[PDB]
């Protein structure tokens with residue numbers, strides 16, 4: 001079960017500005033009504049982030065292999081749960097170990113073993129009209145998984161998978177770092193109402209997890225979900241509809257920031273001490 | 280976390296921050312900012328047979344040193360010369376892993392040693408291990424010596440209005456002294472005020 | 478090897494000091510450097526060895 005998709009149109013890349021996005025709590029200490037200076041791997045203010053989409057009607061299923069230089073800020077604007085996870089590694093071809101974080105329609109799965117990934121890994125939801133339901137059908141990521149070292153599976157649930165038609169209602173932001181064999185993930189979810197072009201504002205990402213994976217990471221790739229129904233004839237490689245989602249990628253560098261904690265202990269503003277002379 | 284393995288007797292000195300050698304270069308690297316202990320003991324009575332014990336392996340060739348706490352379990356043919364090997368293991372192309380030969384009549388420097396490396400952090404986040412120490416009751420509104428999750432001090436404890444996020448245990452002021460703490464049994468926040476004044 | 482009372486001293490010059498070749502055929506029970514870090518020995522260049 002591993003296909004090379006087609007019926008995809010050509011386009012050059014798109015870029016966008018990050019308006020003071022991508023700040024996280026740098027420790028686990030409580031601070032209140034203070035300005036704290038901190039040096040760490042941050043996403044510089046007003047950075048040039050890359051923009052990827054997937055709207056059909058034009059088809060655009062972007063999931064190329066991107067570098068993972070020193071850490072990654074990843075943002076996703078969606079309404080119908082299209083981005084499902086990522087794969088991280090160096091060669092991604094079963095000669096080396098790789099990490100997979102994925103969200104099935106029922107569990108979250110984290111696995112750090114030897115995968116043989118495809119050229120076009122994805123998941124796939126099928127839509128029936130006779131039966132009133134969107135259901136999870138395909139999981140086409142890897143061929144083999146031999147010498148696993150780390151494994152975690154969350155408690156079972158069930159997502160919605162239902163395709164909406166409004167505007168982007170959910171923003172999800174992640175920061176991925178990889179130091180001393182620890183893969184650290186910071187995360188924040190926010191309710192929005194938007195049409196494109198990742199918004200402005202300020203929200204600080206809170207620590208999500210530290211995985212002790214101990215592997216080398218230099219590249220990564222995003223896992224998207226597909227849509228198949230009675231209107232997608234194809235065979236299995238041309239009969240698919242994309243959906244609607246967008247995601248943005250930027251890279252962290254070592255900077256000094258000045259964070260502001262209000263009286264309740266929340267970071268509400270920051271200054272990038274190397275953006276301008278004013279800062 | 281506890282990391283466990285078995286090495287030769289001569290290489291136990293290489294399990295330390297800032298060391299060189301094949302174990303520290305290609306197999307197991309410790310960070311320079313290391314916190315925790317290294318424990319090692321002789322196990323010649325369990326890991327050696329009279330014909331030899333070739334179950335324990337080690338990596339002998341690599342293109343670059345490892346990063347701290349990184350693990351490489353690949354078995355590609357190492358090209359040491361100036362020719363592609365196409366994975367056939369010929370001349371100037373070696374198999375990366377070799378085997379320890381543990382016989383009970385080896386010198387002490389060639390006998391197997393079992394190594395456990397315990398790694399942890401101290402006094403910043405919520406902890407769950409603790410020691411054998413026993414707890415007491417909570418005395419508020421008085422000058423007491425206190426020991427909260429290993430953090431010692433002196434002062435007056437009072438009920439607080441600060442509200443910590445679930446991943447927080449201590450609170451610090453601008454002078455970086457601990458002025459708030461979450462009680463590890465009742466999960467209530469307390470303020471710590473010094474005792475001398477005036 | 479020599480006796481400790483009449484120890485031997487040898488001059489070394491004009492050669493690359495790639496000590497990784499000692500990994501297969503040698504195992505040392507004591508190795509300690511003074512004035513330099515073992516992790517820096519591969520980047521340096523040595524005088525009067």
Ligand SMILES: *[C@@H]1O[C@H](CO)[C@@H](O[C@@H]2O[C@H](CO)[C@@H](O)[C@H](O)[C@H]2NC(C)=O)[C@H](O)[C@H]1NC(C)=O
Pocket residue numbers: 464
């Ligand atoms: C730690 O143990 C203590 C008892 O040793 C628990 O205290 C109980 O808390 C409940 C509140 O739900 C009271 O009704 C009981 O009377 C308490 N017992 C005593 C002896 O005071 C405490 O709940 C334990 N910690 C946790 C997280 O449950």
Ligand SMILES: CCCCC/C=C\C/C=C\CCCCCCCC(=O)O
Pocket residue numbers: 299300301489494496499505508518523526
């Ligand atoms: C003639 C001898 C070569 C002289 C080279 C001079 C300087 C080179 C510096 C250090 C060489 C150290 C050799 C021991 C390596 C042991 C590695 C280990 O297992 O820890």
Ligand SMILES: *[C@@H]1O[C@H](CO)[C@@H](O)[C@H](O)[C@H]1NC(C)=O
Pocket residue numbers: 002003004119
């Ligand atoms: C997919 O395309 C690649 C070339 O880009 C090829 O090597 C591979 O064999 C193809 N696999 C399938 C299933 O078509």
Ligand SMILES: *[C@@H]1O[C@H](CO)[C@@H](O)[C@H](O)[C@H]1NC(C)=O
Pocket residue numbers: 015016017048
């Ligand atoms: C981002 O970098 C590319 C590199 O060519 C450039 O074309 C583009 O204008 C840049 N975007 C911004 C907003 O500066």
Ligand SMILES: *[C@@H]1O[C@H](CO)[C@@H](O)[C@H](O)[C@H]1NC(C)=O
Pocket residue numbers: 104105106107109153
């Ligand atoms: C999702 O994938 C994991 C990976 O093994 C699997 O254990 C789980 O059962 C899958 N989900 C369902 C609903 O089976």
Ligand SMILES: *[C@@H]1O[C@H](CO)[C@@H](O)[C@H](O)[C@H]1NC(C)=O
Pocket residue numbers: 128130131133
């Ligand atoms: C709905 O019908 C489809 C076939 O069209 C079937 O595959 C699926 O299992 C059914 N699900 C439920 C809940 O009936």
Ligand SMILES: *[C@@H]1O[C@H](CO)[C@@H](O)[C@H](O)[C@H]1NC(C)=O
Pocket residue numbers: 146147352
């Ligand atoms: C990984 O798989 C290969 C081939 O199946 C095997 O030789 C090797 O021992 C495995 N790794 C471990 C750690 O056992």
Ligand SMILES: *[C@@H]1O[C@H](CO)[C@@H](O)[C@H](O)[C@H]1NC(C)=O
Pocket residue numbers: 262264
């Ligand atoms: C936290 O402060 C905000 C204003 O910054 C305020 O609206 C809110 O009520 C405070 N939270 C409480 C009540 O603790």
Ligand SMILES: *[C@@H]1O[C@H](CO)[C@@H](O)[C@H](O)[C@H]1NC(C)=O
Pocket residue numbers: 090216217218343344345346
């Ligand atoms: C990480 O993988 C790359 C593959 O391009 C390799 O060159 C590099 O040496 C690896 N990391 C280390 C520390 O060797």
